[PDB]
Design an enzyme around this catalytic site. Structure first.
Site, PDB file in Angstrom:
ATOM      1  N   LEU A  21      35.324  41.320  40.774  1.00  0.00           N
ATOM      2  CA  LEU A  21      34.549  40.377  40.036  1.00  0.00           C
ATOM      3  C   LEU A  21      34.871  38.927  40.428  1.00  0.00           C
ATOM      4  O   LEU A  21      34.086  38.055  40.131  1.00  0.00           O
ATOM      5  CB  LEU A  21      34.937  40.534  38.586  1.00  0.00           C
ATOM      6  CG  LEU A  21      34.084  41.076  37.422  1.00  0.00           C
ATOM      7  CD1 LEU A  21      32.768  41.859  37.762  1.00  0.00           C
ATOM      8  CD2 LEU A  21      34.918  41.763  36.302  1.00  0.00           C
ATOM      9  N   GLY A  22      35.981  38.616  41.092  1.00  0.00           N
ATOM     10  CA  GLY A  22      36.420  37.230  41.266  1.00  0.00           C
ATOM     11  C   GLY A  22      37.805  37.274  41.845  1.00  0.00           C
ATOM     12  O   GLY A  22      38.412  38.361  41.784  1.00  0.00           O
ATOM     13  N   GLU A  23      38.279  36.163  42.443  1.00  0.00           N
ATOM     14  CA  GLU A  23      39.577  36.057  43.218  1.00  0.00           C
ATOM     15  C   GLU A  23      40.111  34.636  43.218  1.00  0.00           C
ATOM     16  O   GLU A  23      39.337  33.720  43.482  1.00  0.00           O
ATOM     17  CB  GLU A  23      39.349  36.415  44.678  1.00  0.00           C
ATOM     18  CG  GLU A  23      40.578  36.367  45.474  1.00  0.00           C
ATOM     19  CD  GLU A  23      40.368  36.978  46.816  1.00  0.00           C
ATOM     20  OE1 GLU A  23      41.088  37.927  47.164  1.00  0.00           O
ATOM     21  OE2 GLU A  23      39.440  36.522  47.516  1.00  0.00           O
ATOM     22  N   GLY A  24      41.395  34.440  42.923  1.00  0.00           N
ATOM     23  CA  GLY A  24      42.048  33.132  43.057  1.00  0.00           C
ATOM     24  C   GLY A  24      43.215  33.174  44.036  1.00  0.00           C
ATOM     25  O   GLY A  24      43.355  34.132  44.754  1.00  0.00           O
ATOM     26  N   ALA A  25      44.078  32.172  44.102  1.00  0.00           N
ATOM     27  CA  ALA A  25      45.154  32.280  45.118  1.00  0.00           C
ATOM     28  C   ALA A  25      46.247  33.289  44.701  1.00  0.00           C
ATOM     29  O   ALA A  25      46.996  33.800  45.534  1.00  0.00           O
ATOM     30  CB  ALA A  25      45.745  30.923  45.509  1.00  0.00           C
ATOM     31  N   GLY A  27      45.587  35.983  42.363  1.00  0.00           N
ATOM     32  CA  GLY A  27      45.003  37.084  41.556  1.00  0.00           C
ATOM     33  C   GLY A  27      43.617  37.474  42.047  1.00  0.00           C
ATOM     34  O   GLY A  27      42.991  36.662  42.700  1.00  0.00           O
ATOM     35  N   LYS A  28      43.234  38.737  41.818  1.00  0.00           N
ATOM     36  CA  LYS A  28      41.899  39.226  41.955  1.00  0.00           C
ATOM     37  C   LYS A  28      41.535  39.691  40.532  1.00  0.00           C
ATOM     38  O   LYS A  28      42.432  40.097  39.828  1.00  0.00           O
ATOM     39  CB  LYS A  28      41.805  40.329  42.978  1.00  0.00           C
ATOM     40  CG  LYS A  28      42.325  39.950  44.306  1.00  0.00           C
ATOM     41  CD  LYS A  28      41.754  40.812  45.386  1.00  0.00           C
ATOM     42  CE  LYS A  28      42.682  40.877  46.596  1.00  0.00           C
ATOM     43  NZ  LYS A  28      43.846  41.967  46.487  1.00  0.00           N
ATOM     44  N   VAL A  29      40.273  39.586  40.078  1.00  0.00           N
ATOM     45  CA  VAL A  29      39.791  40.221  38.820  1.00  0.00           C
ATOM     46  C   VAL A  29      38.825  41.318  39.152  1.00  0.00           C
ATOM     47  O   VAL A  29      38.073  41.128  40.069  1.00  0.00           O
ATOM     48  CB  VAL A  29      39.109  39.156  37.939  1.00  0.00           C
ATOM     49  CG1 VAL A  29      38.593  39.745  36.627  1.00  0.00           C
ATOM     50  CG2 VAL A  29      40.155  38.147  37.568  1.00  0.00           C
ATOM     51  N   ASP A 155      43.179  22.730  28.867  1.00  0.00           N
ATOM     52  CA  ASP A 155      42.113  22.827  29.926  1.00  0.00           C
ATOM     53  C   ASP A 155      40.722  23.346  29.328  1.00  0.00           C
ATOM     54  O   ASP A 155      39.980  24.127  29.959  1.00  0.00           O
ATOM     55  CB  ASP A 155      42.551  23.631  31.128  1.00  0.00           C
ATOM     56  CG  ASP A 155      41.620  23.433  32.296  1.00  0.00           C
ATOM     57  OD1 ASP A 155      40.742  22.498  32.264  1.00  0.00           O
ATOM     58  OD2 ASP A 155      41.745  24.175  33.252  1.00  0.00           O
ATOM     59  N   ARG A 159      33.961  26.394  31.744  1.00  0.00           N
ATOM     60  CA  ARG A 159      34.397  27.373  32.794  1.00  0.00           C
ATOM     61  C   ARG A 159      35.479  28.266  32.327  1.00  0.00           C
ATOM     62  O   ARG A 159      35.743  29.314  32.943  1.00  0.00           O
ATOM     63  CB  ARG A 159      34.950  26.649  34.013  1.00  0.00           C
ATOM     64  CG  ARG A 159      36.066  25.676  33.749  1.00  0.00           C
ATOM     65  CD  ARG A 159      36.468  24.860  35.077  1.00  0.00           C
ATOM     66  NE  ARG A 159      37.559  23.974  34.689  1.00  0.00           N
ATOM     67  CZ  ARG A 159      37.383  22.795  34.154  1.00  0.00           C
ATOM     68  NH1 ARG A 159      36.100  22.327  34.089  1.00  0.00           N
ATOM     69  NH2 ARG A 159      38.455  22.084  33.730  1.00  0.00           N
ATOM     70  N   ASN A 160      36.171  27.835  31.296  1.00  0.00           N
ATOM     71  CA  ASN A 160      37.247  28.551  30.665  1.00  0.00           C
ATOM     72  C   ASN A 160      36.811  29.214  29.298  1.00  0.00           C
ATOM     73  O   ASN A 160      37.660  29.453  28.495  1.00  0.00           O
ATOM     74  CB  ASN A 160      38.378  27.556  30.320  1.00  0.00           C
ATOM     75  CG  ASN A 160      39.101  27.056  31.616  1.00  0.00           C
ATOM     76  OD1 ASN A 160      39.114  27.759  32.679  1.00  0.00           O
ATOM     77  ND2 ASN A 160      39.766  25.880  31.523  1.00  0.00           N
ATOM     78  N   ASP A 173      40.071  32.964  29.871  1.00  0.00           N
ATOM     79  CA  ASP A 173      39.842  32.807  31.383  1.00  0.00           C
ATOM     80  C   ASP A 173      40.938  33.565  32.061  1.00  0.00           C
ATOM     81  O   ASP A 173      41.853  34.005  31.383  1.00  0.00           O
ATOM     82  CB  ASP A 173      39.846  31.353  31.826  1.00  0.00           C
ATOM     83  CG  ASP A 173      41.243  30.710  31.696  1.00  0.00           C
ATOM     84  OD1 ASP A 173      42.081  30.901  32.619  1.00  0.00           O
ATOM     85  OD2 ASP A 173      41.506  30.039  30.668  1.00  0.00           O
TER      86      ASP A 173
END
Length: 299
Positions: A21-25, A27-29, A155, A159-160, A173
């Site tokens: 569903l989504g990816e950061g530096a 983590g992946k969701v 924050d 978006r959160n 989030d």
């Protein structure tokens, strides 16, 4: 050695990972199916965060997060279900919010949206005024909760927050906003990234974060909800936006926004933190206005 949380645990084999569903530096969701998690439905979809490291220190944060998530449980906080440590990567387990983050959900209903949008649970195209006010009022309620605990979010931005079936909106989030919405942050340090456009002058000038700085960001949240997710000060560079917030200039009323909502936003943006209305006060005025939506239309 203090009292501590107690996180529900979960069998890896009970978690069947559908897709990313989504990816950061960090983590992946994923979307996933969880079996016998809540005992009156067998299968159910969930959102599963998988951590990219198991590194000595990156491990003890995951627990410290899990505890805190378990402790904050409320109707407008995204529901956390617990974790899985049995092997690697670590997985955190949340309810699945069909519509994604509120900033995306807003833009997908913008009159600037490229494509229509489906869903049994909401009309495509722009949203009724009562829909916007209920989105608002719901975020305010998460914020009343947190502030009641005396937690500061630091924050808050659409978006959160996250949007579920039937237009349920909850603050929540997955820690990746700086990756997925990196332009909504100013890198002042090395690794230090500030949500400048949602900050009050005292957060920017003194790096002081309070209940009251959260209420300012909430005003910016109402402004995004009313522009259908546009970034505040989007004409402006980060430095110019800082000069603005700092010299006292305020965002302009959106054209979807009735004057009574612009008033609320404007009480969130008082220079002086104490002159700002509590989130309780704001949540009452927004609710009252969601059940009884003013008649608006534009010039």
């Amino acid at each position: 050695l203090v009292p501590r949380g107690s996180v529900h645990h979960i069998k890896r084999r009970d978690i069947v990972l559908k897709w990313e569903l989504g990816e950061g530096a960090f983590g992946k969701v994923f979307l996933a199916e969880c079996h016998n998690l809540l005992p009156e439905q067998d299968k159910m979809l969930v959102a599963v965060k998988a951590l990219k490291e198991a590194s000595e220190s990156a491990r003890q944060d995951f627990q410290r997060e899990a505890e805190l998530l378990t402790m904050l449980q409320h109707q407008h906080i995204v529901r956390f279900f617990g974790v899985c440590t049995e092997g690697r990567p670590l997985l955190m387990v949340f309810e699945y919010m069909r519509h994604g983050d509120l900033n995306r959900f807003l833009r997908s209903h913008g009159p600037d949206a490229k494509l229509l949008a489906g869903g049994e649970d909401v009309a495509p195209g722009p949203l009724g005024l009562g829909q916007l006010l209920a989105v608002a009022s719901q975020v305010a309620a998460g914020m009343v909760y947190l502030a009641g605990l005396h937690f500061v979010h630091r924050d808050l931005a659409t978006r959160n927050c996250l949007v579920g079936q039937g237009l349920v909106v909850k603050i929540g989030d997955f820690g990746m906003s700086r990756d997925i919405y990196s332009t909504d942050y100013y890198r002042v340090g090395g690794r230090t990234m500030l949500p400048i456009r949602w900050m009050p002058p005292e957060s920017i000038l003194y790096r002081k974060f309070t209940t009251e700085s959260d209420v300012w960001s909430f005003g910016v949240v109402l402004w995004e909800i009313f522009t259908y997710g546009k970034q505040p000060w989007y004409q402006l560079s980060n430095t110019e936006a800082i000069d603005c917030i700092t010299q006292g200039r305020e965002l302009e009323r959106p054209r979807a926004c009735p004057p009574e909502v612009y008033a609320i936003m404007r009480g969130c943006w008082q220079r002086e933190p104490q002159q700002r209305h509590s989130i309780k006060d704001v949540h009452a005025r927004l609710q009252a206005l969601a059940q009884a939506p003013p008649v608006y239309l534009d010039v």
